[PDB]
């Protein structure tokens, strides 16, 4: 209730902090998440470079459309795990970097807009799973210890 609302706000903070990191905009889960999500983002940018070059992300709406279409396909089997969750943040960063390169409308707040749709997807698709699987401290961080 208030618990689901708190969960979404927490996910939003995680997403905002990750995306800020991605763009060098001025906690332990944040630190480890930033490192692993960025390692994924780098892998994607390097290995799927030609596919990423088939999109021009000229607007926030285009970013949202592509994010959702890709994520929907990724998650169509209904499988959730921390690996899957990490890839959502990563792909959000991938798209934010493209948006910053290709956006036509002046948008200095783009990472805020992207953080919102990324947080909504994470909450809507994986929010219950996260609380059922140890949360960020007793679930996600424990994967590295």
């Amino acid at each position: 209730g208030s618990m689901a609302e708190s969960e979404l706000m927490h996910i939003h903070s995680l997403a905002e902090h990750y995306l800020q990191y991605v763009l060098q905009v001025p906690s332990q889960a944040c630190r480890v998440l930033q490192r692993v999500a960025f390692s994924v983002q780098k892998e994607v940018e390097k290995n799927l470079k030609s596919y990423l070059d088939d999109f021009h992300v000229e607007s926030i709406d285009t970013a949202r459309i592509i994010f959702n279409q890709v994520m929907e396909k990724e998650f169509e089997d209904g499988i959730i795990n921390w690996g899957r969750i990490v890839t959502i943040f990563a792909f959000g960063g991938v798209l934010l970097k493209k948006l910053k390169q290709e956006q036509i409308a002046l948008d200095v707040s783009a990472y805020k807009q992207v953080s919102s749709f990324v947080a909504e997807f994470i909450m809507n698709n994986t929010g219950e799973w996260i609380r059922q699987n140890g949360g960020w401290e007793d679930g996600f961080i424990k994967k590295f210890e």
């Binding site: 692993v36 994924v40 892998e43 994607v44 290995n47 799927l48 596919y51 990423l52 088939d54 999109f55 592509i66 279409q69 890709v70 994520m71 396909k73 990724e74 795990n81 921390w82 690996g83 899957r84 990490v86 890839t87 990563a90 792909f91 994967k143 590295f144």
Partner: peptide, 22 residues
């Protein structure tokens, strides 16, 4: 086609992580 190969790569990467950490 591009969205499918991206999604499949993310699935593969997610799987790699899952297998490593379990």
């Amino acid at each position: 086609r591009a969205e499918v190969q991206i999604a499949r790569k993310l699935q593969c990467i997610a799987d790699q992580f899952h297998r490593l950490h379990t």
